Write an enzyme that holds these catalytic residues in place. Structure first.
Site, PDB file in Angstrom:
ATOM      1  N   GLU A   1      96.087  47.700  70.072  1.00 17.69           N
ATOM      2  CA  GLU A   1      94.793  47.953  69.258  1.00 17.69           C
ATOM      3  C   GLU A   1      93.501  46.639  69.210  1.00 17.69           C
ATOM      4  O   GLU A   1      94.217  45.538  69.231  1.00 17.69           O
ATOM      5  CB  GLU A   1      95.431  47.966  68.088  1.00 17.69           C
ATOM      6  CG  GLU A   1      94.524  48.166  66.675  1.00 17.69           C
ATOM      7  CD  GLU A   1      95.199  48.624  64.920  1.00 17.69           C
ATOM      8  OE1 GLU A   1      95.762  47.861  65.024  1.00 17.69           O
ATOM      9  OE2 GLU A   1      94.979  49.139  64.778  1.00 17.69           O
TER      10      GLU A   1
ATOM     11  N   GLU B   1      87.187  48.482  57.766  1.00 17.05           N
ATOM     12  CA  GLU B   1      89.295  48.627  57.463  1.00 17.05           C
ATOM     13  C   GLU B   1      89.346  48.478  55.806  1.00 17.05           C
ATOM     14  O   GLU B   1      88.569  47.026  55.766  1.00 17.05           O
ATOM     15  CB  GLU B   1      90.246  47.911  58.306  1.00 17.05           C
ATOM     16  CG  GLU B   1      91.327  48.694  58.174  1.00 17.05           C
ATOM     17  CD  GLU B   1      92.367  48.189  58.938  1.00 17.05           C
ATOM     18  OE1 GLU B   1      91.722  47.672  60.172  1.00 17.05           O
ATOM     19  OE2 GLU B   1      93.365  48.193  58.689  1.00 17.05           O
TER      20      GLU B   1
END
Length: 270
Positions: free
Chosen positions: A139, A241
């Site tokens: 990620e 996020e």
């Protein structure tokens, strides 16, 4: 050697300050990448059904560079709203040549997105030949900005206190120093279920809300430090996020484009 493109279709991020209206709103988890009308881009929303109300509104193919979106959250449980390139076709990053993103947005203030938050470029990659199984799934984040928290100002860069993991080095690109961080996530949510995987971070030491990201330069720097992405890039999207809190993200420009080493445009919107 890489020539930065000079094409007239590239929108100057420094002056891209017009508020956008009339987008298409998504209020629920998308269940992965989903297509966008008249666009090469895909969006994804992760809106945990155990958390509060969140949304992503795509501003459309015909304004704001084609990838511009707004997002809102009210007490989320790790909200992710993202939009951009979806790949996932067994190709390494090098296949996509020089990737750029021009951006300009406004957002809610400090401490409106929880103890951790990220704004910038995001995705995953798969490495079927990784020497360690922990690094078979990656990620990645290029962090341009965040909302800070009760301990740290949003005007100063986050560090390992927020991300966890280990500082791997630093480099200067797109007008700022970036700190490189590698972190191992142990038995955590991922695109391959709850498992152990690795995170790569480039943290901009001078947080900003507008500019151009030379994305491929980050991939190259990570590779030089032995932070391999492998031969199966999943996506390359612009992300907000939010760990918690109540706030918004509102982009006036998100424009992805790709160019060869001689600066010739391979892909651009609109």
């Amino acid at each position: 050697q890489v020539v930065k493109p000079t094409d007239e279709r590239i929108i100057d991020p420094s002056t891209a300050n017009t508020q956008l209206t009339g987008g298409v709103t998504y209020n629920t988890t998308s269940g992965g990448n989903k297509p966008l009308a008249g666009s090469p881009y895909g969006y994804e929303t992760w809106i945990d059904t155990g958390g509060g109300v969140c949304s992503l509104t795509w501003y459309g193919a015909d304004q704001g560079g084609g990838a511009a979106f707004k997002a809102t959250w009210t007490n989320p449980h790790d909200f992710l709203g993202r939009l951009g390139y979806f790949w996932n076709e067994n190709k390494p990053y090098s296949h996509y040549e020089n990737i750029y993103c021009g951006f300009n947005y406004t957002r809610s203030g400090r401490k409106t997105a929880g103890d951790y938050s990220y704004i910038g470029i995001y995705g995953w990659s798969r490495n079927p030949s990784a020497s360690n199984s922990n690094e078979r799934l990656i990620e990645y984040y290029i962090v341009e900005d965040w909302f800070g928290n009760q301990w740290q100002a949003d005007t100063s860069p986050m560090g390992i206190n927020t991300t966890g993991g280990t500082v791997m080095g630093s480099f200067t690109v797109d007008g700022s120093s970036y700190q490189i961080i590698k972190n191992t996530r142990v038995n955590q949510p991922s695109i391959e279920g709850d498992k152990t995987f690795v995170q790569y971070f480039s943290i901009r030491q001078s947080p900003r809300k507008s500019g151009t990201i030379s994305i491929t330069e980050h991939f190259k720097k990570w590779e030089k430090l032995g932070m391999k992405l492998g031969d199966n890039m999943y996506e390359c999207k612009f992300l907000i996020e939010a760990g918690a809190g109540e706030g918004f993200f509102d982009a006036r420009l998100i424009q992805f484009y790709r160019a060869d080493n001689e600066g010739n445009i391979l892909q651009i919107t609109p």
